[PDB]
């Protein structure tokens, strides 16, 4: 539920930081996709 429950270790700390960079990257790219689609959609509405 609240957490992934990988067991506390320096390994798991590094794996979670790697997942955070992956997820923050994934957010930023999919947000860019949404912005481009939103711009085209607003252009289409005006047209």
């Amino acid at each position: 539920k609240d957490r992934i429950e990988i067991f506390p270790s320096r390994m798991a700390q590094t794996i979670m930081k790697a997942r955070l960079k992956g997820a923050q990257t994934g957010r930023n790219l999919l947000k860019k996709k949404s912005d481009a689609l939103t711009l085209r959609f607003r252009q289409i509405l005006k047209k």
Binding site: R10, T14, K17, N28, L29, K32, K33, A36
Partner: protein, 460 residues
């Protein structure tokens, strides 16, 4: 004046424990007194008194205690703490971490016997850093310029070419030339091939007369690695604050020094602090790093560049964490640029020279520099953002402006950051490259540069 009294020699070794030889019946020992041990076979060894209690003295022996013998060992007490045999003739020379020479030259004819530990530079006599040091590397000089008297680490990671960057800085470093510069290159925990690289690269590639080089090898005894920064900085303080030199001190891997603090702490049987390092690691790093700065009433100064192998690639680790609290900024060396074969792989984005704004500009470099660096940062940051957009939208969807920023990123990595290990670029040649890159944009896109600076420097 000096120690007129004769040295005592003790056979009274009451025990041995790991790296420690425990003398007893000692007459008035000093804490950190240096001692010269003689093994039963007559082999000389060195050590320093790690602890004292009445008649006892716990000598930490430098070399390992192999061959020590409680019945026949003898220990000559020097009566004094460790002193650097410091002089200006330490420039042009190579020393091991104890201060014994290894360039086949003689012992040093000391101008003074400075205590290795130094003393704190008085906060009232420090003066703010105000003129650039050229390192010769564009990713430093044109983006993260080092003010003379600044402390700025090169954060790196295992496998990255930070030793080649540090050696390139040592060959190329100098004043701005709008004479009395010098390098002290304190190398700690260096594997034997990297030590041959430092010694031989400085000998061959045109540098020795400006540099004093300390080489503590990875397998040299760990307390000599603790001594090495204190030994080097004591020389840099002599050169800068008595010989009026502008010194640059390069510390080649503070992580291998931090590992030596952890070992010497365990030797005292101190309880391990935060992540196993000593609790006082912050004070010990400050005791190294703060032996730096300009001072009032003297032309000389010490800059420092502590190179630092971040464990596990993580800047949160206590070695880089405590360094970031003491040093004015950081420079980051990046596995992404290194794997792209971009040398030097210095990533100019997470890098920040906290004092660059007071290293550069009119009468210190060319007056465009602050503007050029801010705009190069923007064009590289925007170009990275556009490469991340090209992944999503596909190239035909990019605007003309986005296509300029993506071409800037390609050319900035291939011409500004890429340099090669024997190419030396003045700050002027770096700013000229900075302009020949920024000149890719329409004049109006250079929004971080004032219209005055553009009218003076945008016309090719």
């Amino acid at each position: 004046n000096y120690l007129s009294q004769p040295r005592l020699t003790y056979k009274t070794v009451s025990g041995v424990n790991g790296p420690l030889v425990i003398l007893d019946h000692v007459k008035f020992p000093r804490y950190a007194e240096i001692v010269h041990l003689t093994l039963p076979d007559g082999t000389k060894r060195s050590g320093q008194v790690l602890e004292v209690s009445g008649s006892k003295a716990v000598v930490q022996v430098f070399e390992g205690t192999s061959g020590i013998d409680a019945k026949k060992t003898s220990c000559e007490f020097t009566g004094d703490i460790l002193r650097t045999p410091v002089s200006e003739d330490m420039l042009g020379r190579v020393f091991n971490g104890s201060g014994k020479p290894i360039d086949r030259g003689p012992v040093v004819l000391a101008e003074d016997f400075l205590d290795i530990m130094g003393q704190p530079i008085n906060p009232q006599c420090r003066i703010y850093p105000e003129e650039m040091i050229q390192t010769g590397i564009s990713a430093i000089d044109g983006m993260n310029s080092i003010a003379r008297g600044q402390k700025i680490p090169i954060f790196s990671a295992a496998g990255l070419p930070h030793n080649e960057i540090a050696a390139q800085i040592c060959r190329q470093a100098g004043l701005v030339k709008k004479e009395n510069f010098a390098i002290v290159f304190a190398a700690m925990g260096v594997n034997m091939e990297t030590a041959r690289f430092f010694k031989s690269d400085f000998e061959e590639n045109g540098s020795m007369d400006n540099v004093c080089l300390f080489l503590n090898l990875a397998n040299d005894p760990t307390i000599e690695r603790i001594i090495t920064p204190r030994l080097a900085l004591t020389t840099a303080e002599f050169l800068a604050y008595q010989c009026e030199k502008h010194v640059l001190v390069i510390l080649t891997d503070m992580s291998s020094y931090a590992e030596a603090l952890r070992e010497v702490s365990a030797a005292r049987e101190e309880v391990p602090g935060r992540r196993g390092f000593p609790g006082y690691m912050y004070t010990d790093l400050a005791t190294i790093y703060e032996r730096a700065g300009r001072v009032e009433g003297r032309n000389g100064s010490i800059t420092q560049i502590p190179i630092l192998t971040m464990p596990n690639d993580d800047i949160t680790h206590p070695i880089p964490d405590l360094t970031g609290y003491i040093t004015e900024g950081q420079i980051y060396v990046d596995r992404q640029l290194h794997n792209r074969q971009i040398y030097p792989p210095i990533n100019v984005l997470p890098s920040l020279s906290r004092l660059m704004k007071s290293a550069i500009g009119e009468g210190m470099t060319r007056k465009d520099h602050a503007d050029v660096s801010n705009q190069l940062y923007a064009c590289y940051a925007i170009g990275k953002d556009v490469q991340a957009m090209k992944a999503v939208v596909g190239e035909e969807a990019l605007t003309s402006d986005d296509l300029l920023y993506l071409e800037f990123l390609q050319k900035f990595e291939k011409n500004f950051i890429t340099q090669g290990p024997y190419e030396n670029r003045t700050v002027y040649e770096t700013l000229d490259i900075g302009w020949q890159l920024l000149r890719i944009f329409p004049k109006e896109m250079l929004k971080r540069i004032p219209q005055s600076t553009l009218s003076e420097f945008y016309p090719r």
